[PDB]
Design a protein around this ligand. Sequence first.
Ligand code: A1EIY
Ligand code: MG
Length: 533
Amino acid sequence: SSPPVVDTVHGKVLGKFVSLEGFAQPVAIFLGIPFAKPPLGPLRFTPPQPAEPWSFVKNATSYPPMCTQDPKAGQLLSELFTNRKENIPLKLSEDCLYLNIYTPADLTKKNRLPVMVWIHGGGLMVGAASTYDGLALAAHENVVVVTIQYRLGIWGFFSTGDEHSRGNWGHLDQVAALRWVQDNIASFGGNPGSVTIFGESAGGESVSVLVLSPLAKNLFHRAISESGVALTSVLVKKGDVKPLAEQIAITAGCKTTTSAVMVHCLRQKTEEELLETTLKMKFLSLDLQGDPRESQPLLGTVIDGMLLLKTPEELQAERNFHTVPYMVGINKQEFGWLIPQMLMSYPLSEGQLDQKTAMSLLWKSYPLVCIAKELIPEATEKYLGGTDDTVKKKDLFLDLIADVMFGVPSVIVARNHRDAGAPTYMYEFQYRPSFSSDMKPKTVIGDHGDELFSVFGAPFLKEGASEEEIRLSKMVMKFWANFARNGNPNGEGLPHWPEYNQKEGYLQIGANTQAAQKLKDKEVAFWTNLFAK
Ligand SMILES: *[C@@](O)(c1ccc(Cl)c(Cl)c1)C(F)(F)F
Ligand SMILES: [Mg+2]
């Protein structure tokens, strides 16, 4: 039947129908809609500008390029995280400010469905919207799914610390995409007055940053951070960002005479030269050469004065953030496998860890955990000191890193959000998907990213899910879309999910799903005391 054609502010777009067996209404899919002007040439390291209007009908049936990034790490992460049966290879380009739309609405009728805007993870250095197929979630839960892209790495986050390159270009792109959704999603059957932003890892940190940003006012109405938050420190630069900028400029062949000189020089480099620079910097890899206090594993969020006016901690203390319903979740083993072993090349192949090697490694982990050298012994002893079994010590070390990067920051964010009067919900996800890499030990459960397969309905798109895994995905999708509808995940036939209030109820999600109380309470107390120094 006739492919769907939709009028947007800037012109008409042509999509395609895709049926999911068992659902009468095919899903209308629109791939590669631009939400900004391509940030090329002089527009590099500047805020996104509106897309230019087009005559006639734009064909939105091909996946867009992904933003320039390490193609090997980008393809690997896509393969590890995709919910599709086969991973789709993607082109690289600086021309990447696109979004993809999956709408289950019958576009010949009138519809105002809740909108779910996905912000992908990747450390702010890698990733793509097209990795995530919105078909199953859209059809199963009657929501419009929008997957967005945003500038990454040098292109998205290069900052001189001053007005010549403030930084946070990729977060400004996320804001631009949400403004586009406000202005256009009703033409796709979506309700611009019910937009939920959700994301995982750096995407969850981005959601948290948008909750803290005045630029995102009135652009969304619920938020979900999965395994990432603004207090995940490795993603937020405090203090002097000039050394990293100078290192990047020097690696690219640029002089560092002034900030304006550095930025102008970098704007003259080709995409290929800046990718060469990216690869020479060896981001996302644990840096084992030199003082770990000088390690820079990624270019990330800064306090730029436009998107973020103060540090997340200061904004939280001032209660200066958007008090929307907010779901904050973590996985049982955030540092269990994928980040250390696939993304960061951790020296941990051997599977036993003695306490001296653990202390040395935790010092090398400074860019991730920020533990002063004098505090390494106490932190290591707290986690590892209770056993002499060095296999158990390795597992407990992985727990330590997971608590510092994800668990404690997540609970602190949730507590501060709750204390501003906003409806707050928390979860801890514990499941080992059958879609896990064959390289992943069978004992790793609730690894970073494991909930994605449930959220995005992989059991309905990939082969070989058990019946338990199918049930888990339907329940998770319903909770998520109930939250998008109502700011409360609860509903008929679902386990009760208590609000994260003074009792600190949270939902343990897995093969058995049930409410629990006080997530990470002792750990928060320990690490808050330790970091108070
Ligand atoms: C996520 O975006 C992420 C990667 C690396 C690091 Cl250090 C952090 Cl804090 C988050 C993802 F890549 F998805 F794992
Ligand atoms: Mg070094």
